[PDB]
Design a protein around this ligand. Structure first.
Ligand code: MYA
Ligand code: 646
Length: 411
């Protein structure tokens, strides 16, 4: 049973998801005037707080909460340690709404207890291709096309309750208050991902990992030496050999992205993401924000030969705290972000991603099997992990799609 999720406008079961044939809202159309202006009620010893995600101290406060209380693996070996610079980048994109950054603090001494954050996204979330075909076959083209235009909605992330406050039904209250603040802004859908299975994803993909520093990954037990390698005299030497990379990129004309690259990168990215059922639409301002290099946060390279940009890739950094190991404090992970290839095969473009990430001291390259990420898995020696990222909408009925039909990278 789901005492909270059963009350919310999301599909309730997989069986229900199979009956969905058109994109559209779940709930009753409602107005901003219908939405309470007073904050959701909360216990008298707590209070709502809106941190300023551009202000160093407030960013540091939220950073500490997440550092100590955000996503861990099941064996409490690793915990995400999103940096302060990362949080300001993720949470303050163009036209962000400060009121969508929602915290709870203990009233007496202002102890920070919980967080949830929304950001705007312009999303294509109309009926997927395979379902539009079914609609044509049945003379239902019109209903299937009703919500084809890209929508201005909310992306939700960084939901976090302090370890001491777990299993007290605080997460639902955060979710209700975030919903209220978003609805007051006349937005009625959200998109979110989680590693856990909730009612009810519209897509799911496995995580994949590419070892860059296998000796450290084995040391911290992110990886082990696979059985097959025990037939060698030095299993770790062979493992290191297996994962060795060039020390400099191989593509002629690879360089870091510059502000002047924004229009070309926008063009080639938007052309590419069009091929997917669910994907973001990005303005120039949003391309600049999400793709221009930021030290320690996001790294973006373009292939420019003979004064023209033909390809690009981007990756972002999230270190994870290594909880139990004494010798290392962090696992430095690079995550595959947006990319587009027009001049070279995708594997040739992404090999340079691995090369750059390795040169910069990253330990592993991670991604979900979205976009065309499957197309380079084997050649570049990615392996599936035990994790899955599930993709959800709030208040949006959506036919189940494959993860290779998802083009929205979730941070
Ligand atoms: C229109 C605008 C709409 C805006 C809102 C869109 C919706 C956004 C929804 C949020 C998208 C977040 C995207 C991300 O950030 S995913 C990252 C989530 N964060 C973590 O995993 C950090 C570590 N864990 C925690 O901080 C806590 O365990 C959390 C906060 C996750 C739950 O705290 P706690 O463990 O103390 O439990 P509770 O007693 O307060 O509450 C129990 C209820 O919460 C349901 N639950 C558990 N985990 C999740 C989860 N990841 N998404 C949604 N719901 C979740 C659970 O099924 C149960 O409901 P029900 O099964 O009884 O029905
Ligand atoms: C290195 C490491 N550090 N940590 C903390 C872990 C769990 C690992 N192991 S992992 O790499 O193999 C991996 C990774 Cl990265 C991520 C998740 C996961 C779980 C829940 N949710 C998300 N969302 C990402 C998008 N925003 C919303 C939440 C990701 C699961 C695994 Cl299992």
């Amino acid at each position: 049973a789901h005492a909270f999720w059963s009350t919310q406008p999301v599909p309730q079961t997989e069986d229900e998801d199979e009956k969905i044939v058109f994109a559209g809202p779940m709930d009753e159309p409602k107005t901003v005037a219908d939405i309470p202006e007073e904050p959701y009620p909360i216990a008298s010893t707590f209070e709502w707080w809106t941190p300023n995600m551009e202000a160093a101290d407030d960013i540091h406060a939220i950073y500490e909460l997440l550092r100590d209380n955000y996503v861990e693996d099941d064996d409490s070996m690793f915990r995400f340690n999103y940096s302060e610079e990362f949080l300001q980048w993720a949470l303050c994109p163009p036209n962000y709404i400060p009121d969508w950054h929602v915290a709870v603090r203990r009233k007496a001494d202002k102890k920070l207890l919980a967080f949830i954050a929304g950001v705007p996204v312009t999303l294509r979330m109309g009926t997927p291709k395979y379902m539009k075909v079914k609609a044509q076959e049945k003379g239902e083209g019109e209903e299937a096309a009703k919500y084809d235009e890209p929508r201005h909605i909310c992306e939700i992330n960084f939901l976090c309750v302090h370890k001491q406050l777990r299993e007290k039904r605080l997460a639902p209250i955060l979710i209700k208050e975030a919903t209220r603040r978003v609805n007051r802004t006349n937005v009625w859908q959200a998109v979110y991902t989680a590693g856990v299975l909730l009612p009810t994803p519209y897509a799911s993909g496995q995580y994949f990992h590419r070892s860059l520093n296998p000796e450290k990954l084995v040391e911290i037990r992110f990886s082990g030496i696979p059985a097959q390698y025990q037939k060698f005299q030095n299993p770790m030497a062979m493992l290191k050999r297996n994962y060795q990379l060039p020390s400099a990129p191989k593509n002629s004309g690879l360089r870091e992205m510059k502000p002047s690259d924004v229009p070309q990168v926008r063009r080639i990215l938007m052309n590419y993401l069009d091929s997917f059922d669910v994907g973001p639409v990005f303005s120039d301002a949003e391309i600049s924000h999400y793709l221009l290099p930021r030290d320690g946060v996001v790294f973006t390279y373009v292939v420019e030969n003979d004064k023209k940009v033909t390809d690009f890739f981007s990756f972002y950094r999230i270190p994870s705290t290594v909880i139990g190991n004494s010798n290392y404090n962090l696992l430095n992970a690079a995550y595959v972000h947006y990319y587009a290839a027009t001049s070279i095969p995708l594997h040739q473009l992404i090999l340079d991603l691995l090369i750059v990430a390795h040169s910069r001291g990253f330990d592993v390259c991670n991604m979900v099997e979205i976009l065309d990420n499957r197309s380079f898995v084997e050649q570049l020696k990615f392996g599936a992990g035990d994790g899955h990222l599930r993709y959800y909408f709030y208040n949006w009925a959506y036919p189940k799609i494959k993860p290779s039909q998802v083009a929205l990278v979730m941070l």
